[PDB]
Design a protein that fits this description.
Structural class of chain A: alpha+beta
Keywords (chain A): Cytoplasm, Nucleus, Proteasome
Number of helices of chain B: 6
Largest interface: A-B, 7 and 9 residues
Order of helices and strands of chain A: EEEEEEEHHEEEEHHHEE
Shape of chain A: globular
Number of domains of chain A: 1
Radius of gyration of chain A: 19 Å
Largest sheet of chain A: 6 strands, antiparallel
Number of helices of chain A: 5
GO cellular component, one term (chain A): proteasome storage granule
CATH topology of chain A: Glutamine Phosphoribosylpyrophosphate, subunit 1, domain 1
Oligomer: part of a larger assembly
Pfam family, one (chain A): Proteasome
CATH architecture of chain B: 4-Layer Sandwich
Number of strands of chain A: 13
CATH architecture of chain A: 4-Layer Sandwich
Largest sheet of chain B: 5 strands, antiparallel
CATH class of chain A: Alpha Beta
Distance between the termini of chain B: 53 Å
CATH superfamily of chain B: Aminohydrolase, N-terminal nucleophile (Ntn) domain
Family (chain A): Belongs to the peptidase T1B family.
Helix content of chain A: 25-40%
Organism (chain A): Saccharomyces cerevisiae (strain ATCC 204508 / S288c) (Baker's yeast)
């Protein structure tokens, strides 16, 4: 039984016709103190799977090692480590899922919410969630924490049901995600202006965008707002 | 008296450990394998005897990697060979986990060294029936190492073990002399294929299959990798040519 200390916020992701997109700002909060700003919370495992982590950073770092190890271990006595026997997103998920539920069952959880996004060997998109309780689920869009409330309603408007995915392009999808990231910047007191975005396309592969920033924010109307009711000046 | 060779930790009257010595027998009897330390990495090669046309070619791989930067090849009792590598893997993992940095070749060497030497200490265990050539690149260059069932090991410029160990050691020494300035990773792969082809004469009865792997700072980014396809055939040729 622990309690998070340094933490990461929302991790949002959805899937389009050819792959999946996932993003998360680069902040490491410590209470209301936005303490660390260079935190990458998007861990790529191989080049067909990106793992987004929110929650306690120290535990996130721990899960990172597990992932990198899982990569090293797979290469062992495996002449097809970068082919037929390379890591699939589904494997990385199940592993994580396993670990997560085991820790909660031991009353010593890994205080995180995780989203594994990627493309299976047969082209299929993979997107699944798992948290410190071991709960898991999938949906055309997935977000953790604050994104579960603000990001989802936005992304769900792009891909409401399954049949929507093949109709969504990387442009559309990426845009939706970029916007959500902004909205989250407006209303999440624990968010940062800088984030990272990853695209896993069954054709273009893994494109990992770093140091993005929320642009085109609306603030001008703020001037016209004075007082809190009757004040006129 | 006698019988000083029936238990593993016993010292003969002249100060030897016959069990260990008998282990070396199991090794010399094995296939031949070498290691060539080039000027920025190490090349590993091994003799794979084709017991029959039934063995799926390119399939029963021998050379093993430890972590991501270390390579292992051994002659003798293969199962003992793997057993050792497993321990090395745990050994390397334990190390990285605490010090973060991937285990230094030297440190790894002694890690395997102490383990092996450990099996010459009790009569309840059998010594390792393998000699192992291993190495890789680390913070300060490349390193080639060979470990004996006795637990003994040293750093080599070139190393060989097994059936054709002499032909090899013969050839390796020639290289060392005709290359005071060093050999390149590319070149060591070739030279290795040749040296394996020559050492194959002390077993010219059964047909074989070559297997090379290297770890070069400039060629593989300090990562251990198997030499395949074109570069491989190219070496098989450079050897096949000089064997005539």
């Amino acid at each position: 039984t622990q309690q998070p200390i340094v933490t990461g916020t929302s991790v949002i992701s959805m899937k389009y016709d050819n792959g999946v997109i996932i993003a998360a700002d680069n902040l490491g909060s410590y209470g209301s103190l936005l303490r660390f700003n260079g935190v990458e919370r998007l861990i790529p495992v191989g080049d067909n799977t990106v793992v987004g982590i929110s929650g306690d950073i120290s535990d996130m770092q721990h899960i990172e090692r597990l992932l990198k190890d899982l990569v090293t271990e797979n290469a062992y006595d495996n002449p097809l480590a970068d082919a037929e026997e390379a890591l699939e997103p589904s494997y990385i998920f199940e592993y994580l899922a396993t670990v997560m539920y085991q820790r909660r069952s031991k009353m010593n959880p890994l205080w995180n919410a995780i989203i594994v996004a990627g493309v299976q060997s047969n082209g299929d998109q993979f997107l699944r969630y798992v948290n410190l309780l071991g709960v898991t689920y999938s949906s055309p869009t997935l977000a953790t924490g604050f994104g579960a409330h603000m990001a989802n309603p936005l992304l769900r408007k792009v891909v409401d049901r399954e049949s929507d995915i093949p109709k969504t392009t990387v442009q559309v999808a990426e845009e939706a995600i970029v916007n959500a990231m902004r909205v989250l910047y407006y209303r999440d007191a624990r968010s940062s202006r800088n984030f990272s975005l990853a695209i896993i396309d069954k054709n273009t592969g893994l494109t990992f965008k770093k140091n993005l920033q929320v642009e085109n924010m609306k603030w001008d109307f703020a001037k016209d707002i004075k007082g809190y009711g009757t004040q006129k000046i | 008296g006698t019988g000083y060779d029936l238990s593993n930790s016993v010292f003969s009257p002249d100060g030897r450990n016959f069990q260990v010595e008998y282990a070396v027998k199991a090794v010399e009897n094995g296939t031949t394998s070498i290691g060539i330390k080039c000027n920025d990495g190490v090349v590993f090669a091994v003799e794979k005897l084709i017991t029959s046309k039934l063995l799926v070619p390119q399939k029963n791989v021998k050379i093993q990697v430890v972590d991501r930067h270390i390579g292992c090849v051994y002659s003798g009792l293969i199962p003992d060979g793997r057993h050792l590598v497993n321990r090395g893997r745990e050994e390397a993992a334990s190390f990285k986990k605490l010090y973060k940095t991937p285990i230094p070749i030297p440190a790894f060497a002694d890690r395997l060294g102490q383990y092996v030497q450990a099996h010459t200490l009790y009569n309840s265990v059998r010594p390792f029936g393998v000699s192992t050539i291993f190495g890789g690149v680390d913070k300060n260059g490349a390193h080639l190492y060979m470990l004996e069932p006795s637990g003994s090991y040293w750093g080599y410029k070139g190393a060989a073990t097994g059936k054709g160990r002499q032909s090899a050691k013969a050839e390796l020494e020639k290289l060392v002399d005709h290359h005071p300035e060093g050999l390149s990773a590319r070149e060591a792969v070739k030279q290795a294929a040749k040296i394996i082809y020559l050492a194959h004469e002390d077993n010219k009865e059964k047909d074989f299959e070559l297997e090379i792997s290297w770890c070069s700072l400039s060629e593989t980014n300090g990562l251990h990798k198997f030499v395949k396809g074109d570069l491989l055939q190219e070496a098989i040729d450079f050897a096949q040519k000089e064997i005539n």
